[PDB]
Design a protein around this ligand. Sequence first.
Ligand SMILES: [Mg+2]
Length: 288
Amino acid sequence: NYANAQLHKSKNLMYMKAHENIFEIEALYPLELFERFMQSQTDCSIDCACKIDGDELYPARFSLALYNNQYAEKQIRETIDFFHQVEGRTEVKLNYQQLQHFLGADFDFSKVIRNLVGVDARRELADSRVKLYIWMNDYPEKMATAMAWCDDKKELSTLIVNQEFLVGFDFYFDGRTAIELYISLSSEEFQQTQVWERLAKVVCAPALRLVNDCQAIQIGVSRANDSKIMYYHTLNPNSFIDNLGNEMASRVHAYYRHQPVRSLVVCIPEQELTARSIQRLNMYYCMN
Ligand SMILES: [Mg+2]
């Protein structure tokens, strides 16, 4: 985006290092290799994130949105190469069968609109992940494949109104894998009467009522999800966090409230919104 690519990358790394420093996670593998991977890219945008699970916090979470989909194929090659570099430590072994099966032998890289690369580093090495997200547009054969592999209940097929879809690949360091399908709805889209009526047949009421507080939502479905995951692109980050009644989320946002943030996305499993209190959620702070 910005003309001074090298200035912007310096700010990216400074955003990541801050996040690692406040949460005291900098030593987790493979964050240093991820930092180097960032710097090897032409330019990208960073999202710093934290996952909340009861009393536990998993804040070693970062995503890079790689600029210029003209080079989507090369980006995936260099991402895979970075995953192999992470596999440099002997007790880290990834399983690529889901990615390989999804791409097939003649993947149309001209259909990719955005690649994203992620990490969620854990104290328990076996639980850590690297992540690849492939954002696609107007690719009906791959969309149907993703729906068959991720949309058990055939619910996202009743909700989508654009040709874009996001396919996320999880690579656990002990060889576990998961694939996830995400679709998006802007405020303009989900405020249309028929679109909203379709939402209301698939999304439980407490999760649906939250959609109104948003400039956009995404919904992620996966065999590895215990319910649909709602991604709330918050209109007012401060009030959205306050309305969660979650002490740890308020503590996290207490720092970021006064930070130059492009947007705050909060994702909550549908099942959490039918409980007495929210205890599981992710917060993504997408930096400028
Ligand atoms: Mg997921």
